[PDB]
Amino acid sequence: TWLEPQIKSQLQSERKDWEANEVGAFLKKAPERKEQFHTIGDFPVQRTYTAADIADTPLEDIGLPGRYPFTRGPYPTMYRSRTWTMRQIAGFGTGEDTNKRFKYLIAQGQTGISTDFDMPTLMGYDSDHPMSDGEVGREGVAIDTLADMEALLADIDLEKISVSFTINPSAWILLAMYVALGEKRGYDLNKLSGTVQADILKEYMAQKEYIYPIAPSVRIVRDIITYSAKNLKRYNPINISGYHISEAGSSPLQEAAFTLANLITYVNEVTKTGMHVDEFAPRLAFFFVSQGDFFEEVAKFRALRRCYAKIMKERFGARNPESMRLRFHCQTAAATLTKPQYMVNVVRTSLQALSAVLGGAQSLHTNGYDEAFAIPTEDAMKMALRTQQIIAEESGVADVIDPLGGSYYVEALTTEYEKKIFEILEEVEKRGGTIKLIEQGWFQKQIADFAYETALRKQSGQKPVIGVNRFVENEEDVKIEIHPYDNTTAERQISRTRRVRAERDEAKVQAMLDQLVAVAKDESQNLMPLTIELVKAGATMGDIVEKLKGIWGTYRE
Amino acid sequence: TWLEPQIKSQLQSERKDWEANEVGAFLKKAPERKEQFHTIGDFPVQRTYTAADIADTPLEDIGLPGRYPFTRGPYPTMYRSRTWTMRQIAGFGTGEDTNKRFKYLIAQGQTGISTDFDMPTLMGYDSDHPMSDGEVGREGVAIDTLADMEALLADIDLEKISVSFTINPSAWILLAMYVALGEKRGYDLNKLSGTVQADILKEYMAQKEYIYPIAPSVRIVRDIITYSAKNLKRYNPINISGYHISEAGSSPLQEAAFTLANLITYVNEVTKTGMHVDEFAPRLAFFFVSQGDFFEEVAKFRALRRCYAKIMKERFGARNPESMRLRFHCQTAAATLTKPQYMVNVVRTSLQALSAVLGGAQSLHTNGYDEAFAIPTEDAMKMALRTQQIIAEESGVADVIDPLGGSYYVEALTTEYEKKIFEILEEVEKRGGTIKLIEQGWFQKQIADFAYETALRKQSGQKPVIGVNRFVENEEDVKIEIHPYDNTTAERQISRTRRVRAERDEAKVQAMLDQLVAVAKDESQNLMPLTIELVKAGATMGDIVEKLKGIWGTYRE
Amino acid sequence: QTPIRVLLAKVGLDGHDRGVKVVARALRDAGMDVIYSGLHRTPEEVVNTAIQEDVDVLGVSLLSGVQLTVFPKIFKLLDERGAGDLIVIAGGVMPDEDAAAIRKLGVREVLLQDTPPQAIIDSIRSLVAAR
Amino acid sequence: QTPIRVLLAKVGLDGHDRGVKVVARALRDAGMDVIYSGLHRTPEEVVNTAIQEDVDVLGVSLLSGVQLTVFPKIFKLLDERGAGDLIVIAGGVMPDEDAAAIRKLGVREVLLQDTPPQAIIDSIRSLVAAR
Ligand code: B12
Ligand code: B12
Ligand SMILES: C[C@H](O)CC(=O)SCCNC(=O)CCNC(=O)[C@H](O)C(C)(C)COP(=O)(O)OP(=O)(O)OC[C@H]1O[C@@H](n2cnc3c(N)ncnc32)[C@H](O)[C@@H]1OP(=O)(O)O
Ligand SMILES: C[C@H](O)CC(=O)SCCNC(=O)CCNC(=O)[C@H](O)C(C)(C)COP(=O)(O)OP(=O)(O)OC[C@H]1O[C@@H](n2cnc3c(N)ncnc32)[C@H](O)[C@@H]1OP(=O)(O)O
Ligand SMILES: C[C@H]1O[C@@H](n2cnc3c(N)ncnc32)[C@H](O)[C@@H]1O
Ligand SMILES: C[C@H]1O[C@@H](n2cnc3c(N)ncnc32)[C@H](O)[C@@H]1O
Numbered sequence A, B: 001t002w003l004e005p006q007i008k009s010q011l012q013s014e015r016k017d018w019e020a021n022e023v024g025a026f027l028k029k030a031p032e033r034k035e036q037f038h039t040i041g042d043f044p045v046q047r048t049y050t051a052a053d054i055a056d057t058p059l060e061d062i063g064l065p066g067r068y069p070f071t072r073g074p075y076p077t078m079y080r081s082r083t084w085t086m087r088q089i090a091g092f093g094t095g096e097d098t099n100k101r102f103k104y105l106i107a108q109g110q111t112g113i114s115t116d117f118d119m120p121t122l123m124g125y126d127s128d129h130p131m132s133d134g135e136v137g138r139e140g141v142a143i144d145t146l147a148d149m150e151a152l153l154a155d156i157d158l159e160k161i162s163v164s165f166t167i168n169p170s171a172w173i174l175l176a177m178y179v180a181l182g183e184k185r186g187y188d189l190n191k192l193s194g195t196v197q198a199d200i201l202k203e204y205m206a207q208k209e210y211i212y213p214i215a216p217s218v219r220i221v222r223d224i225i226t227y228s229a230k231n232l233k234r235y236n237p238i239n240i241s242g243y244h245i246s247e248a249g250s251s252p253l254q255e256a257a258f259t260l261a262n263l264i265t266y267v268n269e270v271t272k273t274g275m276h277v278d279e280f281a282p283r284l285a286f287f288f289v290s291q292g293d294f295f296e297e298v299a300k301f302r303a304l305r306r307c308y309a310k311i312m313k314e315r316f317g318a319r320n321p322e323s324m325r326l327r328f329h330c331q332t333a334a335a336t337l338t339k340p341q342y343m344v345n346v347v348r349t350s351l352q353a354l355s356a357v358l359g360g361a362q363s364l365h366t367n368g369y370d371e372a373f374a375i376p377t378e379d380a381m382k383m384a385l386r387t388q389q390i391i392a393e394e395s396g397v398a399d400v401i402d403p404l405g406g407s408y409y410v411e412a413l414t415t416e417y418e419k420k421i422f423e424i425l426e427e428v429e430k431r432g433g434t435i436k437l438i439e440q441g442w443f444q445k446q447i448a449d450f451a452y453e454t455a456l457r458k459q460s461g462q463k464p465v466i467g468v469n470r471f472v473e474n475e476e477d478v479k480i481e482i483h484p485y486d487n488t489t490a491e492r493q494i495s496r497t498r499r500v501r502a503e504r505d506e507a508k509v510q511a512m513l514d515q516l517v518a519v520a521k522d523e524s525q526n527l528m529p530l531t532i533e534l535v536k537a538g539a540t541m542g543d544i545v546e547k548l549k550g551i552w553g554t555y556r557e
Numbered sequence C, D: 001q002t003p004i005r006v007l008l009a010k011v012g013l014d015g016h017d018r019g020v021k022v023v024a025r026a027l028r029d030a031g032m033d034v035i036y037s038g039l040h041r042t043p044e045e046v047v048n049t050a051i052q053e054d055v056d057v058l059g060v061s062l063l064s065g066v067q068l069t070v071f072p073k074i075f076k077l078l079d080e081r082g083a084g085d086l087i088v089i090a091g092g093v094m095p096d097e098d099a100a101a102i103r104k105l106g107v108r109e110v111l112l113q114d115t116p117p118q119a120i121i122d123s124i125r126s127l128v129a130a131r
Helices: A005-020 A022-029 A095-107 A146-152 A171-184 A201-207 A214-231 A243-247 A252-271 A294-315 A342-358 A378-393 A408-430 A434-439 A442-460 A489-503 A506-520 A528-537 A541-552 B005-020 B022-029 B095-107 B146-152 B171-184 B201-207 B214-231 B243-247 B252-271 B294-315 B342-358 B378-393 B408-430 B434-439 B442-460 B489-503 B506-520 B528-537 B541-552 C018-029 C043-052 C067-080 C096-103 C117-130 D018-029 D043-052 D067-080 D096-103 D117-130
Strands: A113-116 A163-166 A194-196 A286-290 A328-332 A363-365 B113-116 B163-166 B194-196 B286-290 B328-332 B363-365 C005-009 C033-036 C057-062 C087-092 C109-112 D005-009 D033-036 D057-062 D087-092 D109-112
Touching (some): A005 A022, A095 A146, A095 A378, A171 A541, A201 A442, A214 A434, A243 A286, A252 A286, A286 A294, A286 A342, A294 A328, A294 A408, A434 A442, B146 B489, B201 B243, B201 B434, B201 B442, B243 B252, B286 B342, B294 B342, B342 B363, B342 B378, B442 D117, B506 B541, C043 C057, C087 C117, D018 D117, D057 D117
Parallel strands (some): A113 A163, B163 B194
16 A cells, blocks of 8 residues: 555545535536546446545556566667667558658658558459459568568668568468578578567458467467467567457457467467466467557556566566567557548558557557548558657657656556456456357457457547548548559569479479478478478468468368 | 655655765666756756655645646646637638638537738738738638628637637737627627637737737737726636747746746736726636647646746736636647658647646647648548547546645745746846847847757757658658649638628728727727727728828837 | 338358348338348348348348449349349449449449448338339 | 958848847857948849948848739849859849849849748858858
């Protein structure tokens, strides 16, 4: 206890007085809009918060940044020493196309590379597969071969800038290509900073990018994790993600708790190999959204850091402090942005970027004002970077660590999130674990319920959406520059894939694929070394993916 | 004391440990950008703030909203019951022109009217005076006669919407016109909600709109205040302003303290008439900027409310709680906005609008993205309103009162501002008062020093200004719609002024002007009743202003 | 007098399903017989289901930007099987000119992002009554 | 070899002076003899001072949007008094085409918002040397 009980009593007595005197008189003059107000994530909120409301939370649970339980930040110096990475997503056409956008984004002030891939690549298909028709380089960049990655990362010093890949069931193939590229370039692998999203549990739950059944797919994540721990010192093998859970329609509580449920499953799978938690936990990372409820999102980020620290220390027995410090990439909520009055998205994204900064994010993507129309233009991305640069350089928020620390409301909400998160994590365990609940569609049903209640709240006008159900305009003069699809992308991409297959040693590649099946047949062996040899030898993602479908099959809901 | 000294000791011991362990190790890896960081207003900031930093501030000084010293807000229900007024400035051409913009702004969601006037009107001249040439209806609306105000407020229910006038040395004439209009319309005067800026002390200090020497000009403010207290129950006779002090180049401390210095002078002048503080203090109001330092601006607003409460209670002996509750209009900092990359102003204004809301503002004007070019377009004002509407309806910040309350940083900074403000207010008194220091140019010299240091910091690049000294672009395709000046404004305006003078009873108006000199010659008499009769009779502002120059003279620096 | 039989579909590699699951729940709750194709279906798989299941309406949710390739293929298969009288509707996200180009192909309704679920219920009942 | 004599002016009802006070301090500190006209001066008052005070440069700070009315009046008075060889510069805020239109009238420099004070010092020394 930090609050003197003689003062806690005074506070509680004084508020009860104020509720009947000042509050009672004003509610007569003009009542409040709602009998009970709630956050967007459905947590009930008080009219005001005092020190009495946080008296039950010990000051140790707040503490100091870069010190356990890291509520105030994973680093003790945060933005006074190093700003968050301004890392904007880029992805369309061929490697060359996205490489041009990387260069533009870097010239505009981005400090980290983020790459989004097309559907064939995300789904494990080569550009010429029948399932790929009309989808090559459309929603992101096309990667079939290591040759395409060379085009993608042309003139990019991989040892001097970090490179993120938004790749999931076929993440191991892209990581093998990255390693093969780094070797070809004569780089030190332990100097390569980067990330592959890789988190498959959230794919079954929310993003819907999967190739194989749950079990072999988790083993791949495990192989990515174990390989990176032993071979790539500065590499982040996963981003255990909440973003997609939120964007699929979840509440901030479902986002936070379901991501932590996935973390537990992963740690158990990796430690099962005999790898001690402290060999890999320091390098684990997360990915969260910065949604519309300004204070709730900050409370959620601080609660996640505290919950994560407690789980790693208490449940996993971690002894390295870095194993308990949560590091996360953040993206502003794309689901809050509108097609009508699109420039108003600049305001929405400003507030959401600020919540991420106040929340202590390590990396940030700000969405473009053109979010509800198409993949972004250069101008839209430029505006998203200026947004970050204004917060970083003009607002002053970067100079004081965890400035919201101590806030009666933020502290009470941080504590409410923590308890509600643990309560969910407990039910998941009681109900038989993550995998079983994913198989029962339990997570997905909860997400779907929130998504539907959100849709009904938008319809009734109970949830205000400016331009949609509030201040609606009949805009006839909508002028918007849209990023176009280059119709030569498929022809251009297949040409290279066909060439790579023609130029390669077919016999050696086919033999190496047969070796891969043997490595995959042994659950204890790592898939990474041979996939690195395969991509080098001229194997395509499709060659690798298809060969493994023969022993593992495919997943369907 | 609220913090248990056994815990305060622990906190201070733990931080000293953290400064040498975690902080010491990280500063080796990567040092901080600065040896000592400061707010934009030059207040030094710590790396982080703990409960120990605020232990010397009693919890009574934080307390509850709508309860003394009102740090958390002047009302106990704030935005859960009534949102701040979204009150956008409108002013150009003739009354009819600005009336069209009022209607547009109302249709876009503005909840209060704000009016900016042209230079002739601000300076006390009629549109046809030689000093008016080329300035009629250019920088704001032209008001010469009550006839123009009828055009200005045509089809506007003055009893159903509040009307603000950004009028200063000639504020009494516009208030007389407003009263005359309300009477003509058959409205109850005690139901008229509105404001005249009127604060002349800040005009000598910063805005530079003056007609007469300091002494007779303060007497007019006093007459506005005393008349309104006895005749206009729902009217705000003044907005004691800090905005212009800041915009003239002051620090947030000079802004806060110099505005409070002006308040003291005004209260002394009004109470000198035998009017008790509680007869007028509840109706006094302020006007502040929401500058670029996100947290400093919030701390400043809370500090101002606390300082104001303490002054009114302790120094003036106020007994009515409304006399101690500071109510304020806020405008985002126009001086932070740029001509290069102008759309980026949307981001700047979003953060500044949020600081005002977190700061507990009663009324807010958000600037247009076209601030550095010209008076705003409809689209620019529409975007400024959407900004406010997103914060109010989508962010959730409106549902919890003083959400930053308790924040170790905001609380410590609020307390630092309070002490530094009182320290300045003390020097002003020691140096002989406001008027004497205005006559010595003391306030103005301090403002000018900050303005010059800001210019030098922008030049060196020590103060980052995106688009100006950071991420500078050679934009060749600048497309911006600019609000145009109608070249028929002067002809149209003089036509009406000439007509009003022709149609009136010249003999009766001239006699009433001679009566006004006699009323002005008696410092104890109020100028308001006769100015109401004058404007009704067809007198122009120039007729009234010129007549009084004959007995008072004019001011010059 | 049987309930309105709706097939809600997902075509190609598109894994966006938040909107389709919202529509599905909206229609089931409105008293309709709703069939969801599931993710990653081909136009031939989707057409076959619409016919085999003898649905009144085939609702395609698109967010992948493939509408101009998918819709001509769907109609080509529907014409082949004498199923041109099937009400084909679309939803999701696409440019206004894409919405126009698919209506010109024979799509009866295009109800894109932010369409309140009641408007979807109403349009379906309206389209079924018209035929 | 006397210091550069600058008259910094304010013309019309314009009460904006933050920029003009910044320029004034910048030039005084650079070693120039600086005269400030004060607020609310007429073009005739301003021209008379420039001549009476025998300044090298007449610097007009404008933020009121009157530049196109003010500048023709200033030149008309300067031509009358045989003072056309006086270096006339402008600053403040105005559209690009206004900056252009005044240069066409005879204004030698237009250094608007965000111009660093060193650039103002440099341009003045440069204009005085050129003549
Ligand atoms: C949420 C979201 C996601 C979530 C999806 C979660 C899920 N499981 O559904 C996540 C984060 C996982 C995601 C991933 C991706 N996304 Co996405 N996503 C969005 C976003 C922000 C909102 C879509 C949404 O769910 N809205 C809310 C729901 C309720 O609305 P809805 O789908 O529009 O449905 C309504 C109406 O359309 C209608 N309706 C819908 N279907 C039907 C059907 C019929 C017949 C009828 C009558 C009515 C109807 O009623 C609904 C209720 O009002 C949009 C932008 C946008 N504004 O659309 C981008 C967007 C669709 N995504 C996009 C992209 C590119 C991707 C990725 C390909 C990125 C990448 N390269 O990795 C991946 C693809 C993943 C995959 N497996 O396919 C692009 C598409 C580009 C284009 N089409 O031009 C968009 C436009 C964003 C952008 N600007 O880049 N995304
Ligand atoms: C600060 C400010 C104010 C302050 C002024 C404080 C003061 N005492 O100076 C306050 C809040 C009081 C104010 C009031 C008004 N303002 Co004002 N204000 C501004 C603002 C935001 C910034 C100007 C500023 O000081 N910038 C910082 C200084 C350091 O820069 P500067 O003046 O540009 O000077 C630099 C350069 O120009 C150059 N320089 C300047 N002079 C000279 C001279 C020479 C010869 C040279 C070589 C160089 C040089 O060097 C300087 C240093 O870099 C501008 C918008 C803008 N971006 O300009 C509007 C603006 C100028 N104001 C405007 C208006 C309309 C008004 C009012 C008329 C509103 C009303 N109706 O009541 C009043 C007028 C008051 C009066 N008495 O005249 C408009 C003008 C419209 C137009 N011209 O098209 C603007 C553009 C805002 C808008 N979009 O509406 N304002
Ligand atoms: C479909 C939709 O589009 C949604 C999607 O799926 S798009 C998804 C896109 N995904 C991404 O962008 C993910 C990005 N993720 C990352 O970058 C990482 O995995 C991450 C979360 C760990 C953050 O990493 P990164 O940005 O490099 O920041 P971080 O690791 O904090 O900083 C880099 C270095 O600076 C150091 N550092 C940072 N702050 C410091 C400080 N204050 N003092 C001293 N050092 C500091 C770090 O220790 C690190 O050093 P190391 O490389 O030697 O370990
Ligand atoms: C040159 C540059 O452009 C700079 C310039 O100079 S431009 C300057 C432009 N100036 C302005 O816009 C000034 C505007 N000022 C004002 O509106 C006032 O003087 C003000 C500061 C007091 C704010 O007033 P206003 O907007 O009406 O808000 P406020 O008085 O709080 O609310 C109106 C009513 O609702 C009530 N209210 C507000 N919140 C409430 C709540 N939470 N519960 C119950 N009642 C509430 C108030 O008591 C008041 O009632 P009353 O009329 O019976 O007293
Ligand atoms: C769902 C998320 O996908 C992102 N997104 C998807 N593809 C791209 C791309 N190719 N380029 C930039 N952003 C993209 C959008 O920013 C959205 O926020
Ligand atoms: C100095 C402040 O003056 C305001 N400003 C001045 N005149 C007008 C007007 N006529 N219309 C709208 N805003 C105006 C700008 O918004 C700036 O912020």
